[PDB]
């Protein structure tokens, strides 16, 4: 594999650089700016990207080894990375407020990085611009390739060395052409082969697991979440009957979730799956508990208890497999085959392995499950009502499409129903509980706006829940964004 | 005085819509049952008569108007059953069908006094809400077919000599696109009724009738804050001045500043004598620990009657209890000067009298007030939160307009916030506060209501403002339940 090295100078969006590079189907790794030169050479990158950061290159210990400029490979500096590049290659940096950002229009001239990349007019880019420290004097052998009125050296290039610096963040989508610029650097300037695909990954990952495990037996907890499911499919493909999975239904899962897990793993693949039905045990622990924080502690601790007792019975096991993914890393031995992947790659890998898309491309589901979607006291009675209401909502999201043919399920990051233990009047007079519909679209920055679901979709979901679910006669839609609200109600 | 239209009611569920259409053409009209005696019909002296539809069948029903109406020399329009009734008694014939069947149909017409110049997408074509029940199978004497469909050969008929008209569809429902044009054509052109029924034209007559009714007697009137009792107060004050005393009871379950706005418009601007009772604490004490919504309504209604009655007894030199009774309700002596008006006419009368438009063009407000908008136990703590959130919602509805410049306040029939006694988590730090529901509906002509398709940006701005500005609320939801299957109020 051709690989890109990303050096982290502390910016809050540095991971997005890695996501963009992976989205171009090129392998890459995120390392701190002070990675020793020996490890960099051993990594043998096809190119290096220097991220932004909150510090100032003239007064900071945030200095990478300047030997990176002698490796003979292209280097791209972003904001602080550009300032670092300028500070150490004979240029000058003028101080500003490194916390300030905003929109700007950059004009470019023709270069390897800029040719054929444009927004509404040739050689014009609308960017998410850093208004802080800026390059005030070109380093040696460099040219200006992009400028704005307030930032005369907004983009610079050393053609001989293929060094590039930009004063804006191409990894945030607010820079419309940022992806195109990063692709141009990685695919064309560095010449990195876009071979990092999940079908290409399976055989290498399967071989690494076999070398690691041999004939040993492996246990893996199946939460119902995607990561552990994909870990299961991958490890089973590697070692077959050496894997045992444990699935715990704590009674707080969506409708039919236990059946769907058992069908895709035990029935379809022949994976050995220990199925624990713990609904009654969890409901007993939640009885009379209204505090949401206590509810979260109880459910999490009880789940560990049920899983730990199943682990003890699998006495000839030597590995605990886990669905640890790359954002997590940025007596039983740990087996974590997804450590090098982001969530989107994990999803593609699950489909590649043959898992049903319905189980692999689903909205994330909280650990405490419906426990934080039933306000106040959790009871089987309420969980059963909620599963029906939730399922109707999701059915309609899956079957209603926008103008491009994309379903509203796929357009939203998270969608679910919430059970409110208050009663409303309805029509013969009725007096039943209230359901809230929640649907959000999350950004890259831990915020989320509520989805502008079509009115007819909301109306149809409302009609169906009220008529089809005995016990619910009122439906509301959450119109609180994050911030100031949270996505979950508890 | 007024040219008048008489509407005889044969039992159709939409007969009132005929009266609204006629009033909306600025012609006075009254609704009476089909069996109104002939001498009262003559004494009413109508310029024309409309016979409504109905569910019964003219050959097997006692739903028979006095057939002497066809000898009065005034135009008559029969709608569905009214048309069949017309055909049955003037030498035609009715063929039995299912009077419960209705649906869309395209009526083709020929030129007549009723049909000339009225069309939808092609000349001499009407898209109508058709009765598929009993229908005219043989023309009555001197009548001609002026409208037909493939399945209803006699869909419209005219007797030109007598100015009798019969139609097999309902022009009073908006589903008949030209139904209003047809009704106006009959009322304004064929009957020649003068469109003089305006609220400025009504004031002087209404003032004189009140003065003739009351003389120098004293009158008491309950001010709820609603438009009906307010307009009655303004009108009666216009007639008898210091002879009127108003009683305003604040039970602590009103909207923000409601008592101040009522006192300001009446006691300060007009000089009306107003007895102001601040009964907030007393109502809250009686509602403590009460969660059953039916008991809450019972407590609030009975307690209000007691506070008002004690004030009435103290006004010992009073002879009239005035009420804001309006015409839909009608279809110490009682003084009811608004008995002949629909709500929209009452609103125009309120403006005509000089009341501020904001107090007259207001969404209706329930008797039990916020008591049915605070789910479960009602407390001042919750009412104070709700009044704040409700006011923010209303500010945004008033200040945001559609493509024609109409406010979303004016576009909705009813809009309010509802306080939910459940807590949600929020965000820096972690908050845990109550939930508010926004409710907004648009009512139809048929006692149904759909929830308002408020712009997403408006819901978003209201959500943000309530959560940020109202200490105690950290979550806002929008009610997306229509009627049916839900009710407008939550309790």
Residue B412: give its domain's CATH number.
3.30.300.10
Report if residue B367 sits inside a domain.
Answer: no
Query: Is B227 assigned a ligand-binding role in the annotation?
Result: yes
Q: Does residue A207 share a domain with residue A164?
A: no
Phi, psi at residue A472, to the nearest 5°? -115, 130
Task: Pick B485's closest partner by Cβ from A422, A427, A481.
Answer: A427
CB proximity list for B350: less than 8 A, separation 6 or greater: B227, B230, B231, B234, B359, B360
Cβ proximity of B447 and A390 under 8 Å: no
A275 membership: H or E segment, kind and range? strand A272-277
Report if residue A223 sits inside a domain.
Answer: yes
Rg of chain B on CA atoms, in Å: 26
Cα four-point dihedral sign A320, A325, A330, A336: positive
Within 13 Å and on the Cβ side, how many CA atoms surround B437? 28
Q: How far apart are CA A162 and CA B116, in angstroms?
A: 83
Q: How far apart are CA B322 and CA B245, in angstroms?
A: 10
A462: nearest CA partner in chain B: B481
Cβ proximity of A131 and A96 under 8 Å: yes
Q: Is A214 left (phi over 0), alpha (psi -120 to 50) or beta?
A: left
Q: Does residue B384 share a domain with residue B358?
A: no
Cβ proximity of A93 and A48 under 8 Å: no
Cα four-point dihedral sign B264, B268, B271, B277: positive
Cβ proximity of B164 and B182 under 8 Å: no
Q: Does residue A358 share a domain with residue A387?
A: no
Cβ proximity of A353 and A233 under 8 Å: yes
CB proximity list for A263: less than 8 A, separation 6 or greater: none
State whether A476 and B476 contact (CB < 8 Å).
no
**Is any Cβ of chain A less than 8 angstroms from the Cβ of B434?**
no
Q: Give all strands (DSSP E) within B205-312, no chain letters.
A: 219-223, 244-250, 273-278
Q: Does residue B143 share a domain with residue B21?
A: yes
Chain B residues in contact with A471 (beta carbon < 8 A): none
Cβ proximity of A435 and A475 under 8 Å: yes
State whether B467 and A455 contact (CB < 8 Å).
no
Strand partners, A219: A244, A320
Interface-testing mutation among A445, A474, A484, with chain B (most B C-beta atoms within 10 A): A484
- To the nearest whole angstrom, how far is the Cα of B430 from the nearest Cα of chain A? 10
Of A79, A151, A190, A245, the active-site residue reads A79
Q: At what angle do helices A279-286 and A292-313 cross, to 10 degrees?
A: 150
Give Cα separations from A54 to A78, A81, A292 (angstroms): 12, 11, 37
Chain A residues in contact with B484 (beta carbon < 8 A): 427
Strand partners, A432: A424
Please report which residue ranges of B160-257 form alpha helices under DSSP H.
179-184, 199-214, 227-240
- Which structure tokens are listed for B119? 């069309």
State whether A427 and B293 contact (CB < 8 Å).
no
Q: What share of chain A is helix, strand, coil (3-state, %, to 5)?
A: 35, 25, 40
Please report which residue ranges of B435-475 form alpha helices under DSSP H.
456-469
Residue B170 among the catalytic residues: yes
Cβ proximity of B199 and B120 under 8 Å: no
Q: How far apart are CA A283 and CA A289, in angstroms?
A: 10
Q: How far apart are CA B180 and CA B221, in angstroms?
A: 37
Residue A169 among the catalytic residues: yes
Interface-testing mutation among A480, A482, A483, A488, with chain B (most B C-beta atoms within 10 A): A480
Cβ proximity of B230 and B274 under 8 Å: no
Which CATH number does the domain housing residue B156 bear? Answer: 3.40.50.880
Question: Of A362, A392, A421, which residue is a domain's last?
Answer: A362
Q: How far apart are CA B188 and CA B182, in angstroms?
A: 10
State whether B293 and A425 contact (CB < 8 Å).
yes
Please report which residue ranges of A354-488 form alpha helices under DSSP H.
357-360, 380-399, 408-411, 455-468
Residue B80 among the catalytic residues: yes
Query: Is B230 assigned a ligand-binding role in the annotation?
Result: yes
- Which structure tokens are listed for A270? 């022949």
List the Cα angle B125/B192/B12 in 5-degree steps: 60
CB count within 10 Å of CB A276 equals: 16
Tell the burial category of A53 from Cβ atoms under 10 Å away from its Cβ (0-12, 13-18, 19+).
buried
Of B26, B88, B132, B170, the active-site residue reads B170
B21 membership: H or E segment, kind and range? helix B15-24
Q: Does residue A218 share a domain with residue A117?
A: no
Residues preceding gaps in chain B (C to N > 2.5 Å)? 331, 427
Q: How far apart are CA B39 and CA B399, in angstroms?
A: 54
- In 3D space, the residue among A439, A435, A437 whose CA is nearest the CA of residue A467 turns out to be A435
Q: How far apart are CA A489 and CA B426, in angstroms?
A: 8
Give Cα separations from B296 to A458, B307, B324, B378, B422 (angstroms): 31, 17, 25, 9, 19
Phi, psi at residue B82, to the nearest 5°? -60, -40
Chain B residues in contact with A426 (beta carbon < 8 A): 485-487
Q: How far apart are CA B460 and CA B455, in angstroms?
A: 9
Report if residue A368 sits inside a domain.
Answer: no
- Which structure tokens are listed for A1? 């594999």
**Is any Cβ of chain B less than 8 angstroms from the Cβ of A485?**
yes
- Which structure tokens are listed for B308? 């008002």
**Is any Cβ of chain A less than 8 angstroms from the Cβ of B460?**
yes
Q: How far apart are CA A19 and CA A16, in angstroms?
A: 5
Cβ proximity of A386 and A416 under 8 Å: no
Q: How far apart are CA B253 and CA B276, in angstroms?
A: 15
Q: Does residue A139 share a domain with residue A9?
A: yes
Q: How far apart are CA A295 and CA A291, in angstroms?
A: 6
B473: nearest CA partner in chain A: A485
**Is any Cβ of chain B less than 8 angstroms from the Cβ of A484?**
yes
Resolution in A: 2.3
- Which structure tokens are listed for B473? 């609320």
**Which domain range does residue B309 map to?**
196-362
Within 13 Å and on the Cβ side, how many CA atoms surround B154? 25
- Whether residue A137 is preceded by a cis peptide bond, meaning omega within 30 degrees of 0, is no
Question: Of B333, B362, B391, which residue is a domain's last?
Answer: B362
Q: How far apart are CA A193 and CA A344, in angstroms?
A: 20
State whether B476 and A475 contact (CB < 8 Å).
no
Residue that is written with structure tokens 């949401």 in the block: A292
Q: Does residue A345 share a domain with residue A231?
A: yes
Cα four-point dihedral sign A283, A284, A285, A287: positive
Cα four-point dihedral sign A326, A330, A335, A340: positive
Cβ proximity of A315 and A164 under 8 Å: no
Q: How far apart are CA B469 and CA B489, in angstroms?
A: 25
Q: Does residue B399 share a domain with residue B314?
A: no
A452: nearest CA partner in chain B: B456
Query: Is B226 assigned a ligand-binding role in the annotation?
Result: yes
**Is any Cβ of chain B less than 8 angstroms from the Cβ of A432?**
no
Q: Does residue B349 share a domain with residue B221?
A: yes
Strand partners, A334: A320
**What approach was used to elucidate this structure?**
X-ray
The β-bridge relationship of strands B48-51 and B76-79 is: parallel
- In 3D space, the residue among A13, A17, A15, A92 whose CA is nearest the CA of residue A57 turns out to be A92
Q: Does residue A126 share a domain with residue A22?
A: yes
Residue that is written with structure tokens 């229509």 in the block: B482
Assign B76 to helix, strand or coil: strand
Question: Of A194, A212, A243, which residue is a domain's last?
Answer: A194
Domain count, chain B: 3
**Is any Cβ of chain A less than 8 angstroms from the Cβ of B301?**
no
Burial pattern A314-348, b for ≥16 Cβ within 10 A else e, equals eeebbbbbbbbbbeeeeeeeebbbbebbbbebbbb
Q: Does residue A214 share a domain with residue A331?
A: yes
Q: How far apart are CA A387 and CA A393, in angstroms?
A: 10
Tell the burial category of A72 from Cβ atoms under 10 Å away from its Cβ (0-12, 13-18, 19+).
exposed
């Amino acid at each position: 594999q051709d690989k890109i090295l990303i050096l982290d100078f502390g910016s809050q969006v540095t991971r997005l650089i890695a996501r963009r590079v992976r989205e171009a189907h090129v392998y890459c790794e995120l390392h701190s700016f002070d990675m020793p030169l020996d490890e960099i050479k051993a990594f043998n990158p096809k190119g290096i990207i220097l991220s932004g950061g909150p510090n100032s290159v003239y007064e900071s210990d945030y200095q990478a080894d300047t030997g990176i400029f002698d490796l003979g490979i292209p280097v791209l500096g972003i904001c602080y990375g550009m300032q670092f590049m300028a500070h150490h290659l004979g240029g000058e940096v003028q101080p500003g407020n490194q916390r300030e950002f905003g929109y700007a229009q950059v004009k470019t001239i023709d270069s390897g990085l800029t040719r054929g990349i444009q927004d509404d007019a040739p050689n014009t880019l609308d960017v998410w611009m850093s208004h802080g420290d800026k390059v005030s004097k070109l380093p040696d052998g460099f040219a200006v390739i992009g400028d704005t009125p307030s930032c005369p050296i907004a983009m610079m290039e050393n053609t001989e060395k293929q060094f590039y610096g930009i004063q804006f963040h191409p990894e945030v989508t607010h820079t419309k052409q940022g992806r195109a610029l990063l692709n141009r650097f990685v695919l064309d300037i560095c010449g990195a082969q876009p071979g990092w695909t999940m079908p290409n990954y399976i055989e290498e990952a399967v071989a690494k697991i076999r070398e690691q495990v041999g004939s040993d037996e492996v246990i893996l907890g199946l939460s119902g979440g995607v990561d552990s499911s994909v870990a299961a499919a991958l490890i089973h493909r590697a070692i077959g009957d050496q894997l045992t999975c444990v699935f715990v239904d704590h009674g707080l899962l969506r409708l039919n979730e236990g059946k769907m897990v058992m069908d895709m793993f035990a029935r379809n693949l022949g994976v050995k799956v220990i199925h624990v039905d713990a609904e009654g045990q969890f409901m007993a622990k939640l009885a009379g508990v209204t505090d949401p924080e206590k509810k979260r502690k109880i459910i999490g601790a009880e789940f560990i208890e049920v899983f730990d007792a199943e682990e003890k019975k699998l006495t000839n096991a030597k590995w605990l497999a886990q669905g640890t993914i790359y954002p997590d890393v940025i007596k039983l031995k740990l087996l974590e085959p997804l450590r090098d992947l982001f969530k989107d790659e994990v999803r593609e890998l699950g489909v590649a392995l043959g898992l049903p898309r319905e189980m692999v491309y689903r909205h994330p589901f909280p650990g405490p499950g419906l426990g934080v979607r039933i306000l106040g006291e959790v009871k089987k009675e309420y969980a059963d009502l909620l599963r029906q209401a939730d399922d109707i909502f999701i059915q309609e999201l899956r079957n209603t499409t926008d103008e491009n043919g994309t379903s509203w399920y796929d357009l939203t990051s998270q969608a679910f129903a919430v059970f409110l233990p208050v009663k409303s009047v309805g029509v013969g007079r009725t007096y039943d509980y209230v359901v809230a519909l929640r649907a959000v679209i999350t950004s890259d920055f831990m915020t989320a706006h509520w989805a502008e679901l079509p009115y007819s979709l909301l109306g149809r979901v409302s009609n169906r829940i009220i008529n089809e679910v005995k016990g619910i006669n009122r439906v509301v839609y959450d119109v609180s964004g994050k911030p100031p609200a949270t996505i979950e109600w508890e």
